[PDB]
Amino acid sequence: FKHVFVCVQDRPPGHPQGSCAQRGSREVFQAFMEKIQTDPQLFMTTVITPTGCMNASMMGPVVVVYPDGVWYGQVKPEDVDEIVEKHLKGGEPVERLVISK
Amino acid sequence: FKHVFVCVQDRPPGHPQGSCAQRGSREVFQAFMEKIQTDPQLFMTTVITPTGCMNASMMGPVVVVYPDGVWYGQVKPEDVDEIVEKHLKGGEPVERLVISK
Ligand code: FES
Numbered sequence: 001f002k003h004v005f006v007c008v009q010d011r012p013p014g015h016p017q018g019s020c021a022q023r024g025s026r027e028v029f030q031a032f033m034e035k036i037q038t039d040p041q042l043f044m045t046t047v048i049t050p051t052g053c054m055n056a057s058m059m060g061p062v063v064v065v066y067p068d069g070v071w072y073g074q075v076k077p078e079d080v081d082e083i084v085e086k087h088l089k090g091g092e093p094v095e096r097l098v099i100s101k
Numbered sequence: 102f103k104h105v106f107v108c109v110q111d112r113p114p115g116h117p118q119g120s121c122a123q124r125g126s127r128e129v130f131q132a133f134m135e136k137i138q139t140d141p142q143l144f145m146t147t148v149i150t151p152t153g154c155m156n157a158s159m160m161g162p163v164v165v166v167y168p169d170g171v172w173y174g175q176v177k178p179e180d181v182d183e184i185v186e187k188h189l190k191g192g193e194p195v196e197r198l199v200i201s202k
């Protein structure tokens with residue numbers, strides 16, 4: 001079982017740190033949701049949860065995978081397939097996007 | 102390090118499963134936030150994150166603690182202190198409220 005948390009927080013335009021939604025994170029969340037179901041293997045072992053700010057906004061979109069404890073930053077919708085394949089199915093975090101383990 | 106996720110999802114009244122917010126979970130979230138921000142031994146090591154539905158709504162309010170992977174249900178605001186003391190600090194999940202590990 002893996003639990004994927006995607007920050008979907010939006011902020012008003014003057015917020016210094018911006019927001020993950022402004023940086024494309026709702027499209028990230030959507031891309032995870034489109035995968036996790038059109039894939040039987042993902043669907044029965046993976047949960048995708050939208051969240052408010054996880055306090056790393058300037059490095060967003062922020063995606064966290066538990067129980068592994070892998071924090072990703074700068075995630076694009078185009079990166080969701082690699083995270084699904086390599087990490088959620090393969091067990092190997094996508095090193096280039098990691099901001100914390 | 103502990104990461105607490107509190108479902109704060111609301112739903113319209115016809116939704117069969119209801120919602121964590123209708124079951125008091127925004128007050129649960131607020132209680133966790135107040136506690137962590139005012140406890141010198143948690144404020145540097147604990148994150149409290151609000152979420153959308155985590156697919157256990159009839160057991161709400163749903164609270165999940167990672168990386169432990171402890172799922173709580175039926176959490177009242179009045180139970181937050183016990184979870185903070187016994188689990189977040191003490192390392193012993195509040196057995197009575199656990200719905201999954
Ligand atoms: S808005 Fe996403 S981590 Fe702050």
Ligand code: FES
Pocket residue numbers: 108109110111119120121122153154155156157158159161163
């Ligand atoms: S509304 Fe909270 S788990 Fe579904």
